């Protein structure tokens with residue numbers, strides 16, 4: 001057993017600050033006090049152990065058994081993450097082999113409000129979830145190195161040389177606007193309990209820059225106190241969970257129709273008697289007191305029969321292509337942990353049943369992020385700007401995925417869906433023209449997807465509410481009023497001029 005030893009040891013680096021887009025702190029590394037011990041030294045001072053046990057709130061017997069069972073080790077933790085006062089209280093006992101060191105611990109000042117986006121670090125300040133993990137290399141910095149001389153008990157007797165200084169991690173500014181994030185968090189929360197709903201997500205996106213301005217989910221958790229949390233509570237559902245978008249994808253079906261050369265908005269479809277058999281299967285409308293509807297009316301009344309007949313005429317392939325081009329069932333490139341691509345199925349032959357289901361948004365699966373990104377492209381005159389979770393100063397070129405005229409026509413139809421008699425009037429945003437589409441999917445999921453202001457769009461938004469429990473479960477009743485409140489608040493905070 002050696003009389004001395006020499007060891008190159010790590011100098012930990014200070015982890016980078018995560019901020020919102022305006023520099024509001026979301027994740028900050030602050031010094032906590034850690035007490036550790038060298039048992040080989042403790043073993044020389046047993047009369048001090050009970051005083052030490054007491055100061056640590058430990059039973060004297062269990063503490064003594066712990067030191068005895070570790071008699072051959074040079075390192076154990078006593079307690080991690082005290083205040084300096086708490087440290088100095090123990091250090092005042094002057095117990096041999098007991099030492100304090102300051103180490104960095106993440107604090108999350110907004111806690112539950114941004115937990116799913118920001119994620120968290122382990123006790124070693126390593127990014128283990130969300131942005132903390134996705135940008136770990138950026139935030140972590142580079143540990144330094146130094147050479148210590150240790151005596152026969154592994155006690156540090158000299159600092160010989162520093163070979164490398166630590167390099168701190170880098171500041172990261174998210175795209176999130178904490179002001180919009182708090183507004184969404186609170187409104188989605190108020191909505192959940194108003195409808196006795198299980199779970200929900202809300203996404204707000206900048207249609208010009210591709211930036212995620214808000215991303216909230218219920219349920220949530222306090223990342224500063226992760227003791228006894230539900231595993232459900234930690235899911236970033238907006239990126240992690242996939243659902244059938246139902247009627248919210250009808251604007252893409254319609255984009256394919258207006259692009260085909262075969263359809264204009266004042267064209268007519270006969271949807272009487274509100275059902276359509278195709279062999280074994282029957283397509284069914286919620287409301288079944290219509291015969292002739294124009295394409296705008298097909299959206300206002302959300303007629304499954306109407307969108308299905310259009311889809312038969314233009315063919316599923318045209319609709320599939322629009323949905324693929326606006327990013328449905330495609331990688332976002334965000335690289336967020338557990339992030340889902342979902343499923344936009346393909347066929348060589350599209351039979352009539354698959355053709356109809358695709359057109360009204362059954363048999364495909366998307367994330368809330370994806371559905372928001374598609375509404376952003378439609379709102380941005382058919383140009384998709386690539387998605388960002390980080391502040392965008394230099395906006396990359398977007399890709400024209402829907403012709404500008406077709407996008408402009410579908411925008412106007414979606415404004416009528418909100419503004420017209422029989423429309424989703426609860427989605428109306430006071431002072432503004434707004435546009436979007438309600439959806440309901442299967443126990444129900446309640447959807448609203450929209451953008452505003454209609455005259456020069458700035459913001460796309462998706463509200464998803466899981467299993468509302470009141471007699472009203474339609475997207476137009478459950479999700480639309482949340483869209484209204486949050487869209488109103490977000491446009492005021494962003495100083496967007498009233499267009500109505």
Ligand SMILES: *C(=O)[C@](C)(CC(=C)O)NC(=O)OC(C)(C)C
Pocket residue numbers: 245246247248286302304360438439440441442
């Ligand atoms: C759209 O979401 C559709 C396809 C039509 C609509 C009500 O907006 N959803 C639908 O038909 O929902 C149920 C009634 C659950 C089938």
